Subunit: 198 residues, 2 copies
């Protein structure tokens, strides 16, 4: 069982000091997957955005601490349900290899609480995908039920045979806000990808 390197895999970069403070720029090491242009290049707290957030004692948004370390990565979409999807993507160094089983695990978070008078109850739905090149090899499209203010672990697996047409292409990961519900924000954390003989 081997780990494949992922940059900023727990969104711990940058370090954030204050409880529930967050960034509004793409997490370091990741790019914004934006197939529908929902996330503007220059964002504010009133636009769709993504970034990292510190989950600590005193958080008003969760009933538990970050799955890993201090921070989570979050994606919030302001457009109405059905408008499209957005999230994070990272292209890895490793390439697809035959006779190997891949295991992608990532923690998915559903916001909780209330701010002002508005509640964060609700979830847009998630999809976690494992890629080779531009191809989605395997994906978990919203299979887990996650309660408000909680996290749960998603597992995606894929076995690559010697005749798989995408061998030698770069592995990739996408973490996606499906925007099929409100509250239309979600979190991810603790991304891990391992390989083993198949």
């Amino acid at each position: 069982v081997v780990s494949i390197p992922i940059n900023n895999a727990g969104f711990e970069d940058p370090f954030i000091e204050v409880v529930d403070d967050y960034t509004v720029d793409t997490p370091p090491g990741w790019t914004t997957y934006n197939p529908n242009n929902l996330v503007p290049e220059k964002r504010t707290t009133w636009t769709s955005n993504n970034g990292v957030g510190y989950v600590g004692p005193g958080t008003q948004f969760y009933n538990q601490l970050a799955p890993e370390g201090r921070n989570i990565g979050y994606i919030y979409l302001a457009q109405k349900p059905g408008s499209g999807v957005a999230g994070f993507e990272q292209i890895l160094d490793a390439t697809l290899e035959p006779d190997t089983k891949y295991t992608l695990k990532v923690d998915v978070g559903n916001f909780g609480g209330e701010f002002q008078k508005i509640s964060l109850a609700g979830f847009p739905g998630y999809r976690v995908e494992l890629l080779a090149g531009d191809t989605v090899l395997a994906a978990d499209h919203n299979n887990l039920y996650i309660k408000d203010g909680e996290f749960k672990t998603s597992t995606v697996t894929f076995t690559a045979t010697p005749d798989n047409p995408y061998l030698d292409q770069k592995l990739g990961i996408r973490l996606i806000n499906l925007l099929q519900g409100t509250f239309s924000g979600l979190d991810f954390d603790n991304v891990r990808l391992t390989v083993e003989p198949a």
Copy 2:
């Protein structure tokens, strides 16, 4: 407690097929051809992209087991090269999405083995199983199971609908999809089951 939702021709048993390893090339009754990329022609031959049902019986040259359910399986074959698109079966159910309910969709997915007219059937295009409400894919298994030539495995897709889900009261739907991300670019489905139960 756990209630089954009615699905038409859910084991692809209609039409009856008499001869082992014989197949149809027209859309199974009760299902529609899901064709977002126009890969499947309206009129099909044995060698066009096609779909239909097939009898998997004793003596079959294509699997190491019989159909997971009954006599027949439903299949989808795509002749275009990997990366061209996807196609499969779709059925809209009569039931609608209900609040505070957990849905469990199960379908057996089959990987052909053997050879047909000297063409090797080894390989798999990848599959996706989708639960939908209206036009929305609520939950889906995109190719998570590894399935060897000549075998079947059960895909499980779960979804929990809360009271504020925007798609409540829209009609439930199912899609069984050939991903066309490998050759041999055909696969099978069987034994579609959908249950609903209270979640919370």
